[PDB]
């Protein structure tokens, strides 16, 4: 499945959602930001999640208010859906 959030506040996603996003593992996370050095904080991300244990804290976790963004967390498809 595919998690993409609203505003990530600084826990953005790539490491961070792979192990803050839940329970099981993703297959993969596209944020924006680039931690290979800058370490960015911004708004938009998607990762490939089995969503069952994402999918609990998905639909919690996220869009929680944070300083002045907050991430939402939603299912979208999986490889073809």
């Excluded at 993703?26 to 990762?47: D, H, Q």
């Amino acid at each position: 499945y595919t998690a993409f959030l609203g505003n990530l506040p600084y826990d953005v996603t790539e490491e961070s959602i792979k192990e803050f996003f839940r329970g099981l593992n993703i297959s993969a996370v596209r944020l924006p930001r680039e931690p290979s050095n800058p370490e960015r904080l911004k708004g938009f991300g998607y990762a490939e999640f089995e969503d069952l244990d994402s999918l609990l804290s998905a639909l919690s976790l996220n869009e929680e208010s944070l300083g002045n963004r907050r991430i939402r967390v939603d299912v979208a498809d999986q490889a073809q859906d």
